[PDB]
Structure 1
Amino acid sequence: LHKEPATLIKAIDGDTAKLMYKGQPMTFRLLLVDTPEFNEKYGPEASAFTKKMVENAKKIEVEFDKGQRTDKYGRGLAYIYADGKMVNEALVRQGLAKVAYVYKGNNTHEQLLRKAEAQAKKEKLNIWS
């Protein structure tokens, strides 16, 4: 896989954000994770985590997997990096997202994220508390 440039347009919630990519606005959904919705437990905490991460970054990048690049809603499906740190992984490592929606052919970072989840679950962080 390879990282490509994008810029933040607006934070949305724990696992979506509006980015400019190839000069067009798109809503991206984070591959291989699920955050709570804003109205659910840990929802606001996930939204705040992702917001801080993407807003404070000097450089946002998107990394598509080998499969579908957009979902049925027209959302971009990617791994999002903030100054080189993967947001997807960070959320899971903090117990603010579960590994989820692991579809065949877009699952390159699955075992990275499952290792993060195991460590969050050992620490009883957040969703795992």
Structure 2
Amino acid sequence: LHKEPATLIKAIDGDTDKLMYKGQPMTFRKLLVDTPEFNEKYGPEASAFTKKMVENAKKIEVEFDKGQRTDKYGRGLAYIYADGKMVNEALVRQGLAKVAYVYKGNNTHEQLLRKAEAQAKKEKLNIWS
């Protein structure tokens, strides 16, 4: 997989961000994760976590997997990176997202995230408390 540049247009919630990619605006949905919606427990905290990460980053990057790049809703499917740190992984490690939506052909980082989830659960963090 390769990292590609993107610029933050607007943080939306734990799972999504409006980004400029190849000079066009696009909602990006994080691969391999499911965060609670704002109205659910830890939803607000998830949104806040990701917002801070992407807003404070000097460099935002997107990494497509080997499979589908856009979902049924026109959203880009990618690993999102803030100053080299994957937001997808960080959410799971902090117990603010579960590993989810793992489809064949789009699961390069499955094990990495699952490892993070186990550590979050072991630490009884957030979703796991």
TM > 0.5 between the two?
Answer: yes
CA drift of 1:109 comes to 0.0
Deviations 1:100-129 (A, max 9, x none): 000000000000000000000000000000
CA drift of 1:4 comes to 0.1
RMSD: 0.2
CA drift of 1:96 comes to 0.1
Q: TM-score, normalised by structure 2?
A: 1.00
Q: Distance in 1 between matches of 2:67 and 2:102?
A: 12
Q: Which residue of 2 aligns with 1:44?
A: 44
Deviations 1:22-78 (A, max 9, x none): 000000000000000000000000000000000000000000000000000000000
Q: Distance in 2 between matches of 1:79 and 1:17?
A: 12
Unaligned 5+ runs, structure 2: none
Equivalent position SS for 1:13: coil
Deviations 1:6-28 (A, max 9, x none): 00000000010000000000000
Equivalent position SS for 1:29: strand
Mapping of 1:1-129 within 5 angstroms?
Answer: 1-129=1-129
Q: Distance in 1 between matches of 2:112 and 2:37?
A: 24
Q: Distance in 2 between matches of 1:98 and 1:125?
A: 12
CA drift of 1:90 comes to 0.2
Question: Post-superposition, which runs of at least 4 consecutive aligned residues in structure 1 deviate over 4 A?
Answer: none
Unaligned 5+ runs, structure 1: none
Q: TM-score, normalised by structure 1?
A: 1.00
